[PDB]
Amino acid sequence: NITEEFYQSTCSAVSKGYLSALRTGWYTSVITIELSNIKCNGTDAKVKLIKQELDKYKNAVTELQLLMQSTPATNNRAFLGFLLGVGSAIASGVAVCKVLHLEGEVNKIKSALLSTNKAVVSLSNGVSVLTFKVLDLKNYIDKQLLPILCSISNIETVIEFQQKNNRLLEITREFSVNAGVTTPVSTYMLTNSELLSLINDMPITNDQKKLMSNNVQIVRQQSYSIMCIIKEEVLAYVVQLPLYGVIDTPCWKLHTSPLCTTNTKEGSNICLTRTDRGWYCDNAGSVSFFPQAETCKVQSNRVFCDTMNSLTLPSEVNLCNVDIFNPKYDCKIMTSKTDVSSSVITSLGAIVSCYGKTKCTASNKNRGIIKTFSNGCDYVSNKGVDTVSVGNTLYYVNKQEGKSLYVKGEPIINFYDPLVFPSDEIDASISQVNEKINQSLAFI
Amino acid sequence: NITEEFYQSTCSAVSKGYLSALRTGWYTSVITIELSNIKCNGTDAKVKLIKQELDKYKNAVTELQLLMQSTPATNNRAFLGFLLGVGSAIASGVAVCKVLHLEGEVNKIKSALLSTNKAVVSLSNGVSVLTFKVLDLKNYIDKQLLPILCSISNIETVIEFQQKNNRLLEITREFSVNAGVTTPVSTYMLTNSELLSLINDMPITNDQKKLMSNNVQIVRQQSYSIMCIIKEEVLAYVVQLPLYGVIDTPCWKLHTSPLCTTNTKEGSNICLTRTDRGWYCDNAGSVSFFPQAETCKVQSNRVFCDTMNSLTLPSEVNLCNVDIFNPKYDCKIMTSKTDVSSSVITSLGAIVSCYGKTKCTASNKNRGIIKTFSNGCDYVSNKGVDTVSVGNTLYYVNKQEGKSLYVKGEPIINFYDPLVFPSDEIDASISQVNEKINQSLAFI
Amino acid sequence: NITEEFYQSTCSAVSKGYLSALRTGWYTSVITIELSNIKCNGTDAKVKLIKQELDKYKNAVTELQLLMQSTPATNNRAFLGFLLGVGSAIASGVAVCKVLHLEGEVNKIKSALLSTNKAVVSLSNGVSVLTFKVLDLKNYIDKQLLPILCSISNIETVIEFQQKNNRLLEITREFSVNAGVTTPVSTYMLTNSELLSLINDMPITNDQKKLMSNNVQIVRQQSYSIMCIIKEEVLAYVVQLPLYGVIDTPCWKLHTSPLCTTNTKEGSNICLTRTDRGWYCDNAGSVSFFPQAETCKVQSNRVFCDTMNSLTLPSEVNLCNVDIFNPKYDCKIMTSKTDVSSSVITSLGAIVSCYGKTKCTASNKNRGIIKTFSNGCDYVSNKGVDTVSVGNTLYYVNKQEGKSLYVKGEPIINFYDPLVFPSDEIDASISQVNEKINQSLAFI
Ligand SMILES: *[C@@H]1O[C@H](CO)[C@@H](O)[C@H](O)[C@H]1NC(C)=O
Ligand SMILES: *[C@@H]1O[C@H](CO)[C@@H](O)[C@H](O)[C@H]1NC(C)=O
Ligand SMILES: *[C@@H]1O[C@H](CO)[C@@H](O)[C@H](O)[C@H]1NC(C)=O
């Protein structure tokens, strides 16, 4: 299943054996709530609580109408994460909400949901969306609360109205503190049973349905709830769900740590770090590279990522793991003189970069220290090891089952003459450093 | 209204036509909740629920008193975002909460709100703050719950007490998971009707009132709720609201993308990227520049930003868009050899940086691909285009109405000799690169 | 108590007088909720609300069981913050949740909590954890709701069941929008009274107990709630609490701002910035350095940090404050030509970097401007000063009591010849710049 390989030559480790679940597109659906357009002298304590809860309903509608006085929009951005492009996440959902403001477009939705709660509607611009009516407050108020307008009430209707109205109030609270765009999509916007049935009635493959149904918590974190329109007794908000066009392709996570020399005199040390760490997944002949591995969510061996946070690299980028000096791909590195100690916890072990006077160890629960790292970059597997200490920092290692492979090799930092080594190169590569050394050497 | 101009020479696009709403200061207000200092043998099921809800009230007060055992403080920080300064956001509100601990200062507030819920109070240090009493639990408990202390109760008082007490419990929950400082300000801290009336009774211009009232959801996201003091049956917490001293000045958003050469042999390419992307707004003879455009919130054509996240640049910075080689301002760029493909979704179109073997296209809903980008930096408008693909990444473009202008020009990267081009310069400019090239040329 | 020293030579200020509270480890506890495995024809309005609330209970259990279809895991990352290592925060808690899936392990917990709500249990792998039963829904349903299965009910049982079931529903909502791992730990996962007693029954020093009890809001923000297992009528989720192995050691916060020359001709200026800003705390003969001071939480004079976000540096790093040219430690700086104006609000004052044509002032509430900064880097104390203005940005200063010391000195940027000054060095030091200048000088 999950395996790992550490490369002593480049101070890096690769965790193989994962499967992909990349979000490639969006599916926009319209969630609706039918409202009541409702306009005594009694002071009954049972009806006073009804008038109180009914005023919470009037204010919620007014608050949401005041909220839609403008076009919904989220804040847009317009190691190697700074190389990414800039997208507009809710651009697809906003385009669907723009259509619902066209005249007669809401009446098309209101009539389709007249005899059922769930319907597919083709909009005027051509988009085929799935529409869902999740709360019929119009039917409840006009059939139960209106016949009391008095003092013909009971305590059982006060409780039932507070329950039905509570969802509208909570949806309002979320939109009020999020400027009408929320993520992840809470259970008030879409309950678990509603989401599961929404996924089932969705035009996707059987493999996409089973994937989304077995990982609904991830689907929520990758969805947006966009407040849309209140018109003609209909409250509509667009839910924007992820499409996983890439499923079950190989994925692997590259971990990197600084590789420095271990000379005794302080300051005369040179360092080198592979900057291409992150998640990699095979995707359509290329490799989708996610520089900020903190953007992907891992469930057992499934990896959920968003292509918006990816670069599309040639598959030859994998050669940097075996031979960082290969002539087919220019492997990205950074150079530095900052030889500070740290550790990187991998999927099945821990990389340790111990330099200077730092105390680096690997311990077990009952027995204590079992390995003492010397100066340089080293690695230990989580088999038999429970914690790793670098300086004053205690790292817990991941206790997942898997086999690691230690690939011995000469650290490539030893191949560089420190006198002509180009320190302080942040976005560099093997060929750039060689081109810079060749200039410094010719100038001597 | 909204227009856009793409500059082929520098691979950048400017979106003009926006209006400003910059937060320049803070207005601190004091929100109060009057508490009851309350100290049978019956087992009535109606009174047992009252004793349960009353114990939730006692614990909430104790939890908030335990919360104020120290001075409230938020975590402080002390492309071009690293050039920003460091502020203390709640420093103004904390100074107001420090005054409320002075003796007799709380009694001044308690007496001002005796005959009304809303009052302006001048504190001892000279600050004139607006005080609001939003919940009188003291009056409810002492007039309704105290007369039952028994078993003279009904179910209608159990429900009404749970409703009034629920707000205090929720305010407590928020402060417990936020260390007494919350943002945005939820509807439990300040309801929509309370906030709107607070804005109305605020000493500001009529233009500031209408702006804040039409964008209350933004005012929440730019406000802080600071837990303050519990003393003498009074629960006080400071709400810190934004002041928009700059309103309706021109704003524009600068989008930049890497500009590289398109030579066939891999690695021999040089790249150049304008680093001055972000939001720009005219402000008091200068230009307020926001390097991280993700910090500003856009509502239709209004742009809400915080001057704390801005630099104050000369208005001559606008010359970099027309002539990046102008002698009046040193335009900021970065150099690199990393020619990776990406796209930047603009307000009215999309910039495409296609390099190497990447497949870059622009498509429509029904018809599919309509443009195939060649190697280099190019642009397409959202008119007729719905999606843009770079590699394995699908970008949805913004469907907002507006007119774009394509300004043809020679890409400035072609003006540089690659042999003496200074690659890997992150925080550089046009003059710095020229000064570095002149040194490499003189040394040959 | 709190003091501050500004160094005019290096444009930096140190705030001394704080005490440490560094998280060094984790303590995992198991929170349990006993569930009821429950399987009429009446339409009574009192029993219909019971069947409604009972179906919310069935769905909550089903939703949580569907949530555990995989191993819980959070998104992992694998000025000087980029030098930090990479940990797995919930690795310790996940290893405890992995043990609860072993057969018979849950039955050990179920029997220990049979006669009490609070117990210490030694697991099969050897870990001694504290187990807590916080909700016995099994006892409530089987003793009160089961005897009605009808129409023997009252309204007092509908309210009491909605109250007890509400906590399970809220715990479910949090786990649904967080993929089973939440932080901070809300009051639904662990109430304030439960947490305080959990801290009391914890195997730690008396000093750790009093510290955690007086700062429970911080303990929440540094804890994780990990959804674990639902097996044999037991709902278990692991709460992972911080261990503060370092307490009451000296801490100080280093603030830095750009130091530039003030020549009249634009562009001919060189800049220099100390990059070692952040929090420093004495820790076990070394110094724990936190490069991103926004990760530490300050309560009065106590500083709560996490060693996972720290580097372990020699105590000689403190010499950079008095003598940045000391031969014992290579002080980290960055070089630049970007002379932009900004301010840094310190604990007791404000650093001002005024360059070019920027208007930099320091004002008071009633009197207005009292100091006008000239070009260069300067400092003002919060005594008598309420606000600081740099350009169009208004900074409020911290009004905390304390004494500042202005240490006069020649700005070290004046010691460098601009013709051979190495601009655009991001991760550099004093010795690196000298080594680069010596090369440029020998080449002339
Ligand atoms: C200089 O370039 C040549 C050819 O590209 C290469 O073989 C040699 O190793 C380079 N020199 C250094 C010091 O990297
Ligand atoms: C060198 O500097 C001069 C004057 O500043 C300028 O005209 C020339 O273009 C520079 N050379 C290069 C290669 O940029
Ligand atoms: C060159 O190095 C020597 C010895 O390390 C030092 O004394 C001198 O100041 C350096 N020169 C410059 C310009 O920094």
Q: For residue A211, give the amino acid letter.
A: L
Q: Which of A406, A371, A408, A403 is nearest to A386 (CA)?
A: A371
Which residue, judged by its Cα, is nearest atom 7 of ligand 2? B434
Question: Are the Cβ atoms of C177 and A186 closer than 8 angstroms?
Answer: yes
Residue among B82, B76, B252 nearest C342 (CA): B82
Measured distance CA(A402)–CA(B58) in Å, rounded: 52
Pairing, β C224-231 against β C425-429: unpaired
Find all residues with CB under 8 Å of B186, minimum gap 6, and list them. Answer: A173, A176, A177, B170, B174, B220, B225
Residue type, C246: V
Angle at B21 between CA B15 and CA B27, to 5 degrees: 160
- Residue whose token pair is 């001559």: B316
- Cα angle at A362 between A360 and A363, to 5 degrees? 130
Q: What's the rounded Cα separation, in Å, for the pair B74 and B89?
A: 8
Q: Are residues C198 and C265 in the same domain?
A: no
User: What six digits make up the tokens of A223?
Assistant: 């969805």
Strands (E), B375-419: 376-381, 387-390, 393-396, 403-407
Sequence-separated (6 or more) residues with CB below 8 Å from residue B128: B120, B121, B122
In a shared domain, residues A9 and A156: no
> How far, in Å, are B96, B402, C131 from residue B107 at the CA level?
15, 57, 46
Is the separation of the CB atoms in B301 and B248 below 8 Å? no
Cβ contact C87–A391 (<8 Å)? no
Helix axes A155-176, C155-176, angle to 10 degrees: 20
Nearest C-alpha of chain B: how many angstroms from C215? Answer: 7
Q: Which of A226, A243, A260 is the last residue of a domain?
A: A243
CA atoms within a 13 Å half-sphere pointing along the CA-CB vector of A307:
33
CA B105 to chain centroid, in Å, comes to 33
Query: From atom 14 of ligand 1, which residue's Cα is the shortest distance away?
Result: A434
Within-domain flag for C302 = no
CA C197, CA B178: separation in Å to the nearest integer?
21
Residue matched to tokens 């996490």: C306
Within B3-136, strands assigned E span 3-7, 12-23, 25-34, 118-122, 128-136
Query: Do both B283 and B209 map to the same domain?
Result: no
Q: For residue C314, is the peptide bond before it cis, meaning its omega torsion is within 30 degrees of 0?
A: no
- Which method, experimentally, gave rise to this model? X-ray
* d(C-alpha A79, C-alpha A291), whole Å: 6
Maximum Cα–Cα distance across chain A: 101
Burial class (CB in 10 A: 0-12, 13-18, 19+), B73: buried
Q: Which of A338, A337, A340, A364 is nearest to A352 (CA)?
A: A340
Assess if residue B299 is contained within a domain: no
- Which ligand ends up closest to the CA of A433? 1
Burial class (CB in 10 A: 0-12, 13-18, 19+), C37: exposed
Backbone φ and ψ of C304, nearest 5°: -100, 115
Q: Are residues C199 and C222 located together in one domain of the fold?
A: yes
Q: How far is CA C236 from CA A41, B91, C111, C230, C351, in A?
A: 52, 42, 14, 6, 51
A282 and A224 inside one domain: no
Which one-letter amino acid corresponds to residue A317? Answer: V
- Please check whether residues C192 and C266 belong to one and the same domain: no
Alpha helix (H) residue ranges in B310-425 = 319-322
Nearest by CB to residue B25, choosing from C293, C394, C399, is C394
Phi, psi of C7 (to 5 degrees): -110, 105
AA letter at C48: K
Please indicate whether, in this complex, the C-beta atoms of B83 and C340 are within 8 angstroms of each other.
Answer: yes
Q: Where are the alpha helices (DSSP H) in A274-419?
A: 319-322
Angle subtended at Cα A69 by Cα B304 and Cα B402, rounded to the nearest 5 degrees: 70
Contact between residue A15 and residue A252 where contact means Cβ atoms under 8 Å apart: yes
Of A233, A279, A260, A436, which is closest to residue A339 (Cα–Cα)? A260
User: Do B181 and B285 lie in a common domain?
Assistant: no
Q: Is the CB of A441 under 6 A from ligand 1?
A: yes
Residues A13 and A61 in one domain: no
Contact assessment for residue A155 and residue A46, using Cβ atoms and an 8 Å cutoff:
yes
- The answer to whether the Cβ–Cβ distance between B98 and C399 falls below 8 Å is yes
**CA dist., res. B344 & res. A78, Å (int):** 7
Distance A421 CA to ligand 1 centre (A): 13
Burial class (CB in 10 A: 0-12, 13-18, 19+), B285: exposed
Taking one residue from A and the other from B, the number of pairs with CB-CB distance under 8 angstroms is 177
Angle, CA C181 vertex, CA C175 and CA C182 arms, to 5°: 80
Q: Which of B397, B359, B391, B351 is nearest to B375 (CA)?
A: B359
Cis (ω within 30 of 0) for the bond into C203?
A: no
Q: Which chains touch A (3 or more CB pairs under 8 A)?
A: B, C
CB–CB of C17/C8 below 8 Å? no
Residue B303 belongs to a domain: no
Query: Are residues C206 and C282 in contact, defined by beta-carbon separation less than 8 angstroms?
Result: no
Q: How far is the CA of A434 from the centre of ligand 1 (A)?
A: 6
Pairing between β-strand B332-336 and β-strand B425-429 as defined by DSSP bridges: antiparallel
Cross-strand pairs, C240: C28, C224
Domain total in chain B: 2
Contact A21, A244 (CB under 8 A): yes
The verdict on C102 touching A (C-beta cutoff 8 Å) is no
Closest of A103, A143, A227, A141 to residue A177, by C-alpha? A227
B423 to A443: CB separation less than 8 angstroms, yes or no? no
Domain that holds residue B107: 25-243
Give the CA distances from residue A415 to residues A220, A256, A411, A438, in Å, rounded to whole numbers and listed in that order. Answer: 49, 19, 8, 14
- The answer to whether residue C305 sits within a structural domain is no
Which of A210, A211, A393 best probes binding to C when mutated, by most C CB atoms within 10 angstroms? A393
d(CA A347, CA C96): 17
- DSSP code for C86: B
Q: To one decimal place, what's the resolution in Å? A: 2.9
- What is the C-alpha separation between A63 and A59, in angstroms, rounded? 6
In order of B292, C55, C350, C363, C389, the CA distances from C396 in angstroms are 22, 53, 9, 10, 9
Domain boundary among A219, A243, A267: A243
Question: Would you call the peptide bond into B184 cis, given omega within 30 degrees of 0 as the criterion?
Answer: yes
Return the amino acid letter for C71. T
Pairing between β-strand A403-407 and β-strand A3-7 as defined by DSSP bridges: parallel
Dihedral class, residue A341 (left if φ above 0, else alpha if ψ from -120 to 50, else beta): beta
CA distance A157 to A159: 5
Alpha carbons B227 and B205: distance in angstroms, whole number: 28
CA distance linking residue C273 with residue B121, whole number of Å: 45
Q: How many CB pairs under 8 A join B and C?
A: 177
State chain C's maximal CA–CA distance in angstroms.
101
Asked if residue B248 is part of any domain, the answer here is no
Q: Do A91 and B397 touch (CB under 8 A)?
A: yes
Q: How many Å apart are CA B317 and CA B324, to the nearest integer?
A: 10
Report d(CA A183, CA A167) in Å as an integer. 17
**Among C243, C268, C297, residue at a domain's last position:** C243
Domain match, C62 and C210 both: yes
Residues A207 and A276 in one domain: no
Q: Is C286 within a domain?
A: no
Question: Measured from the CB, is residue B361 less than 6 Å from ligand 2?
Answer: no
Answer whether residue C226 is part of any domain.
Answer: yes
B52: CA distance to ligand 1 center in Å?
Answer: 80
Residue of B nearest to A314 (CA): B357
Binding pocket residue ranges, ligand 3, CB within 6 Å: C 434, 437-438, 441
Locus of tokens 């200063």: C397
Task: Tell me which chain B residues have a C-beta less than 8 angstroms from the C-beta of C338.
Answer: 83, 332, 427, 429
Is the sign of the CA dihedral C381, C386, C388, C393 positive or negative? positive
Q: Do A425 and B424 touch (CB under 8 A)?
A: yes
C293 at interface of B, judged by CB pairs closer than 8 A: yes
Selection from A2, A64, A44 nearest residue A348 by Cα: A2
3-state class (DSSP) for residue B121:
strand
User: What token pair was written down for A201?
Assistant: 């009635």
Asked whether C214 and C249 are in contact (CB, 8 A), the reply is no
B162 neighbors C162 (Cβ within 8 angstroms): no
Pair A175, A306 in one domain: no
Q: Give the contacts of B115 (CB within 8 A, at least 6 positions apart).
A: none
HSE (side-chain half, CA atoms, 13 Å) at B260: 26
Instruction: Work out whether the CA dihedral B420, B423, B427, B429 comes out positive or negative.
Output: positive
> Are the Cβ atoms of A85 and B344 closer than 8 angstroms?
yes
Radius of gyration of chain C from Cα atoms? 29
B293, B390, B396: residue with CB nearest A85: B390
B208 and C CB contact within 8 Å: no
Given a contact cutoff of 8 angstroms between Cβ atoms, the answer to whether A259 and A352 are in contact is no
DSSP single-letter state for residue C141:
I
Tokens 């709830």, residue located: A225
Q: Which of A330, A329, A287 is nearest to A428 (CA)?
A: A330
In a domain, A68, yes or no: yes
For a pocket test of ligand 1, which of A270, A438, A440 has the largest count of ligand atoms closer than 8 A to its C-beta? A438
Q: Which atom of ligand 2 is nearest to the CA of B441?
A: 13
Q: Residue type at B320?
A: C
If asked whether residues A230 and A263 sit together in one domain, one would say no
Task: Using DSSP, state whether C100 is helix, strand or coil.
Answer: helix
Cα atoms found within 13 Å of the Cα of residue B213, Cβ hemisphere only: 17
CA C160 to chain centre: 37
Any residues with CB less than 8 A from the CB of B341 and at least 6 apart, and which?
A: A311, A312, B353, B354, B355, B356, B358, B360, B390, B391
CA-based Rg of chain A, rounded to a whole angstrom?
A: 29
The terminus-to-terminus CA distance of chain B in angstroms comes to 53
The helix/strand/coil state of C269 is coil
